[PDB]
Every structure is written in structure tokens, then in C-alpha cells.
Amino acid sequence: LDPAQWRPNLLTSSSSGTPPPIVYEPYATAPRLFGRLDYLVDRGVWSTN
């Protein structure tokens, strides 16, 4: 069993709502706006979780 592949990705810590989540992107790029998915390369083998 791979612990990394079955761990819930808590994207952002729970916010109390006061002040509300206020996020500003001075540099707005698709990886920075929508997020991205990272990968691993193991001897040329391409993988992700």
C-alpha cells in the first residue's frame, strides 16, 4: 500500500471566514491560477500520484 497515493490532499487549511480567504496573483499563469500536477521521473519512468 502506498501511503502517498491514499492520503487526502488538504489543498488549503480551514479558514474561519473572518477575514475571508483573500488571495491575489500578481503573476497569473495557468499553473499558478488553476494549480498544477507534479510528477516524478525514476530512470526515465514518468509517474504521479
Binding site: 488553476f34 500536477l37 509517474s47 504521479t48
Partner: protein
């Protein structure tokens, strides 16, 4: 990626607030969707009484 991950799209619950110069928003106001999406115009007066 070899097959990547079949990620379910992330729900959006934000209120997007785009801030720019008046001449910057011509390039984004030719789209009918822009009036449909961003419908409140908080225009800043360049002078004060």
C-alpha cells in the same frame, strides 16, 4: 505524463475581482461573456474633491 490522473475539476466558490487600468479592460470587454461574468464595475475616480 504517461496517463496522468483523471482529476475531478475543482469547484469554484470565489468572487473573482479583476483590477486594471481603464485602457487595460478594452482588451477583455469585447467578449459577451465578460459582461455576463464580471458585471459590477467599480471604477476609480482619478481625482477627489
Amino acid at each position: 505524463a504517461p496517463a496522468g490522473l483523471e482529476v475531478e475539476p475543482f469547484p469554484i466558490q470565489m468572487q473573482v475581482i479583476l483590477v486594471g487600468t481603464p485602457e487595460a479592460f478594452e482588451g477583455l470587454e469585447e467578449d459577451p461573456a465578460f459582461s455576463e461574468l464580471f458585471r459590477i464595475r467599480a471604477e476609480f475616480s482619478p481625482t477627489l474633491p
